[PDB]
Amino acid sequence: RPAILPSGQILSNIEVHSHRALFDIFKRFRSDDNNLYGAEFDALLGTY
Amino acid sequence: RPAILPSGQILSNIEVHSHRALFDIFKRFRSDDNNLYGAEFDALLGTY
């Protein structure tokens, strides 16, 4: 779910928790949560 | 969301509506449903 290859760097840092209004989803975990390292996919094997 | 390339052909035919209980989910339609024609995707347009 997270990104693999960033495209553009950000020139200016800012406090993010102030500007929650500009964003549509917002998730801020402390440090190294457990969800990032789940590689669990699902797909069709064969069609007929 | 139909298949594009079938892996293998089915050998035998059978009245399938009667044996519907074997399958988990399915759907029949008269002929040439409009839904399976337009297929639109959702793309993320840049990560940062």
């Binding site: 094997l45 064969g46 007929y48 | 089915i10 059978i14 044996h19 519907r20 209980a21 074997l22």
Partner: protein, 287 residues
């Protein structure tokens, strides 16, 4: 058939632990999936070995069941206990912690079955027991009849258009025989009830959307009974594969029986003599 199953085997892995010694416990995950529209396998049940359980008699004892309000004069039901539990196995001996039937000693044959008794007027026609019948009289079941047929009485009995039922005390909603062998009346005990599946509509939640569903379901329905020295109730989780066409028809077969031993003799002859009667054997076990 040539290719009836896809079979995917994963990757092995070796988990260690300590137990005196060292327990290496292998494990390999694998999955399969049916890939043939319609059926792809069948079996016939050709031969027959000895019946794994005895086909004798064992009068079921209710005194292991609770939920029935007792009788006021405690001496009365004390006498009931003191006399009916006498000379009756599977009596709830109050040995520590369980108050369960004591472990019997020695077995004649396979595990002994259990018998029930359902009230019925004396003027029930006898010919209803020659062919395969339903202990209720309303032969509802599910396969032949839509929902609402199991307890209605403004609609005829499908298997006997003549009457409405054949046993008033055993068919009506909230009738007597219902209040003892039903699914949701909390009057079950540790002993198995061979008629538990005949007075139960709780499968109303499991509505049947195809005869093939019931067909495939029969022949592989997990076992409801135990495997000890009796027919005890078993947790539904464990189970075991067993075949029974009863739950598809909800019908029972009459065994070879007669109201006098003097009728069951090698020169069988007449089948109705006097008040005493005989019932020929019409079952899947003609030999």
């Amino acid at each position: 058939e040539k290719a009836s199953e896809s079979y995917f085997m994963g990757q092995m892995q070796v988990a260690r632990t300590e137990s005196g010694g060292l327990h290496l416990q292998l494990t390999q995950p694998r999955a399969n999936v049916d890939l043939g529209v319609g059926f792809t396998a069948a079996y016939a049940a050709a031969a027959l070995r000895a019946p794994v359980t005895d086909m004798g008699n064992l009068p079921q004892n209710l005194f292991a069941t609770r939920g029935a309000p007792p009788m006021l004069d405690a001496d009365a039901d004390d006498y009931l206990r003191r006399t009916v539990n006498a000379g009756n196995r599977l009596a709830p001996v109050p040995v520590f912690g369980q108050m369960l039937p004591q472990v019997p000693a020695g077995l004649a044959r396979g595990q002994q079955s259990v018998c029930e008794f359902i009230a019925t007027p004396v003027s029930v026609d006898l010919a209803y027991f020659r062919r395969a019948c339903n202990p209720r009289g309303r032969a509802a079941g599910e396969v032949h009849g839509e929902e609402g047929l199991m307890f209605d009485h403004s609609h005829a009995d499908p298997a006997h258009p003549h009457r409405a039922t054949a046993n008033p005390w055993a068919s009506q909603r909230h009738s007597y025989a219902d209040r003892l062998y039903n699914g949701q009346y909390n009057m079950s005990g540790p002993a198995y009830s061979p008629c538990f599946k005949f007075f139960t509509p709780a499968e109303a939640v499991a509505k049947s959307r195809g005869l093939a569903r019931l067909i495939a379901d029969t022949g592989a329905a997990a076992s409801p009974t135990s495997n000890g020295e009796y027919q005890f109730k078993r947790p539904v989780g464990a189970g075991e594969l067993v075949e029974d066409p009863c739950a598809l028809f909800q019908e029972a077969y009459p065994p070879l029986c007669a109201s006098d031993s003097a009728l069951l003799r090698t020169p069988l002859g007449a089948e109705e003599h006097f008040a005493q009667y005989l019932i020929r054997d019409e079952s899947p076990l003609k030999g």
